[PDB]
């Protein structure tokens, strides 16, 4: 009873504390720039060779090879210069809501209702790819994966946590206990000190590597956030949700700056992913089209059409050249 | 650097060729998601996750979905690709029951498993006719709609059975079938099946659904029916 | 923050009525479906009764079929459950609970206590 009553004064003096730190609006302030304007991106090319839906993608630190999964059991190395396999690996579990490229480029990292991040080594001296290591340590389905380094790798679940997990050991490392239901995706900051990640309690949280404890909860959303992506300084970072929004929270200002809203549009977020500059937040919808939304003022620059069923991933190249769509029909389309 | 370009795309042609032979394979597998509940009888028509199995020349991939926890708003939606929802459920456990009503209703009235049929598994229907004629848990407590209503006229018991059990039968069918009903689309459609544990032949009824699934996906293709 | 308070509730001679209101914030009440789950003493939760997004299509279970009556407030943001005729099973800790997303009819809520869209309950007590 007691202690009911002090945690609900905590949560209420934490949103009032933030209150006072909104002074302006982000939208208001940014209504004086000029826009992007008319941008309409061409599909460059179409990826097709996936049987099943596409669920995940994520591309690599080079800017060209990109790896995606889908629920056939397959998951494709592609090549977005030449579209072409570079390598296709046969999965244990044909089920794979995540996967990810290592920021060295030689591992590479997948996962779904098994509950088992399993990463695979691309150079390998035999010549076939091979399982480095399966982290097998979660209760529910593994929603993401993302590389720290080759050492060490960031894992989101369906055990209601977060942890992080070191592949020469082979157990995990450090544990992010803090949400109330389901997590399903992450992201790593530029310095990968720290790390963001949404979930279906509506509610993001950043994580610190080191310490092993949330920093600060935030709260901008009224249904389940898919998808998470930082902003590429690392001050900020977007959420896609079931509620139909995206909502940009800052780090230093500790609650949500700008909501990406429009009414005709009645369908959750799948995934999201801003560019190099930091302009176009590219959110991916239910609808089977992904909104390029201004992340400056909060208007909807453009818009993908091309797929037949969702698109479930939406990832950016490091450089900032080309975007790639992943989508439930089984054809990336990469874009630039 | 010429040769590079090419080797990599003749080894393409490999990964492509090994590609379009799991192709073939896969596209004739039929993926099912048989779900159920605590002491629903899922265990026994199947506790592994993956099935395979081999029935008439058509290999079946049948997944169970109990490794992970029963919030189950985000990983079923891993299951659109599916060929039937096999979803089991309990007769006799009534308090117990509705929830699974409304875990029908769910999965009925869910965007991306509009497109799946169900082939629904009422088992325990032997264990159901044991408590419906002893009379110490009446359904019309449970299920008020019950005490007016009928036995249907196309029902089809087997020899021996008592019209208080076909009643307490076809009525079980009811609830879940008019959710069924009430979404006026014809995208797909329920099959109910009366099934107990030492009832074999379930699998031979799963081959009866499928293809009639299927054969009504075919036929909407063509705008036929 | 997405919470749901559960007012009213407590203690009612059997045969009588108590009328729950569950005051929401946080989120746009009129897109979700609403309804109403309950824990009673050393049982596991179940679903009670739901109502629509409009207010139309209202279901119950059949141990409070006729005697509850579910209904919303899409105004102001609150969720409501006038019970009628309470029996000695009824005493249960009734949680309103929205459904996880909007524009649409499919909840999979009834969830293992971990489930952040709904409140932290109200103790309906029965005793004579």
């Known amino acids: 009873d007691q202690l009911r009553q002090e945690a609900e004064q905590l949560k209420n003096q934490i949103r009032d504390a933030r209150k006072a730190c909104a002074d302006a609006t982000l939208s208001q302030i940014t209504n004086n720039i000029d826009p992007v304007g008319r941008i309409q991106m061409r599909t460059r090319r179409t990826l097709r060779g996936h049987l099943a839906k596409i669920y995940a993608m994520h591309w690599g630190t080079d800017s060209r090879l990109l790896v995606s999964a889908s629920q056939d059991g397959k998951l494709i190395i592609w090549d977005s210069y030449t579209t072409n396999k570079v390598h296709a690996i046969p999965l244990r579990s044909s089920w794979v809501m995540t996967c990810a490229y290592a920021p060295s480029g030689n591992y590479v990292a997948c996962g779904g209702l098994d509950n088992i991040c399993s990463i695979y080594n691309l150079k390998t001296r035999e010549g076939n790819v091979r399982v480095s290591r399966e982290l097998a340590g979660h209760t529910g389905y593994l929603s993401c994966c993302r590389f720290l380094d080759d050492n060490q790798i960031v894992t989101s679940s369906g055990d209601t946590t977060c942890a992080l997990w070191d592949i020469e050991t082979g157990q995990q490392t450090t544990t992010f206990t803090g949400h109330t239901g389901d997590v399903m995706s992450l992201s790593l900051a530029p310095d990968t000190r720290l790390f963001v990640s949404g979930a279906c309690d509506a509610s993001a949280k950043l994580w610190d590597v080191r310490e092993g404890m949330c920093r600060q909860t935030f709260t901008g959303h009224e249904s389940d956030i898919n998808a998470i992506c930082f902003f590429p300084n690392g001050n900020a970072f977007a959420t896609g949700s079931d509620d139909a929004t995206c909502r940009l929270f800052d780090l230093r200002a500790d609650q949500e700056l700008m909501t990406y809203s429009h009414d005709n549009i009645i369908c959750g977020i799948t995934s999201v992913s801003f560019s190099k500059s930091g302009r176009l937040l590219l959110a991916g919808y239910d609808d089977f089209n992904c909104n390029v939304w201004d992340a400056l003022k909060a208007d909807r620059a453009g818009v993908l059409a091309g797929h037949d069923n969702r698109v479930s991933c939406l990832g950016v190249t490091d450089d900032g050249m080309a975007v790639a769509t992943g989508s439930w029909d089984s054809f990336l389309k990469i874009w630039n | 650097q010429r040769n590079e370009e090419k080797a990599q795309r003749e080894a393409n042609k490999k990964i492509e060729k090994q590609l379009q032979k799991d192709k073939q394979v896969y596209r004739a597998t039929h993926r099912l998601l048989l779900l159920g509940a605590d002491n629903s009888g899922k265990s026994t028509i199947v506790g592994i996750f993956e099935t395979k199995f081999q029935v008439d020349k058509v290999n079946f991939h049948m997944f169970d979905v109990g490794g992970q926890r029963d919030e189950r708003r985000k990983w079923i939606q891993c299951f659109n690709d599916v060929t039937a929802i096999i979803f089991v459920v309990d007769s006799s456990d009534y308090n117990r029951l509705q929830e699974a009503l409304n875990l029908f209703k769910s999965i009925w009235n869910n965007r991306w498993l509009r497109t799946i049929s169900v082939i629904l598994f009422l088992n325990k229907q032997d264990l159901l006719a044991e408590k419906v004629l002893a009379g110490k848990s009446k359904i019309e407590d449970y299920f008020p709609e019950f005490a007016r209503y009928t036995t249907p006229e196309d029902a089809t018991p087997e020899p021996g059975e008592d019209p208080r059990v076909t009643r307490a039968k076809y009525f079980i069918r009811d609830e879940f079938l008019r959710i069924s009903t009430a979404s006026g689309d014809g995208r797909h459609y329920c099959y109910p099946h009366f099934t107990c544990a030492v009832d074999t032949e379930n699998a031979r009824r799963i081959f009866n659904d499928c293809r009639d699934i299927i054969q009504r996906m075919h036929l909407r293709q063509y705008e036929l029916l | 923050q997405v919470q749901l308070q559960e007012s009213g509730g407590g203690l009612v001679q059997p045969g009588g009525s108590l009328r729950l209101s569950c005051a929401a914030s946080?989120?746009?009440?009129?897109?979700?479906?609403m309804n109403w789950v309950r824990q009673a003493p050393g049982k596991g939760l179940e679903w009670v009764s739901d109502?629509?997004?409009?207010?139309?299509?209202?279901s119950y279970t059949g141990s409070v079929k006729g005697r509850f009556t579910i209904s919303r407030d899409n105004a102001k943001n609150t969720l409501y459950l006038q019970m009628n005729s309470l029996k000695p099973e009824d005493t249960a800790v009734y949680y309103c609970?929205?459904?996880?997303?909007?524009?649409?009819?499919?909840?999979?809520?009834?969830?293992?206590?971990?489930?952040?869209?709904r409140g932290q309950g109200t103790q309906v007590t029965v005793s004579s």
């Open positions: 609970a929205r459904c996880p997303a909007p524009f649409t009819r499919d909840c999979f809520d009834v969830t293992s206590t971990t489930y952040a869209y």
């Open positions: 946080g989120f746009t009440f009129s897109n979700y479906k």
């Open positions: 109502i629509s997004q409009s207010g139309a299509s209202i």
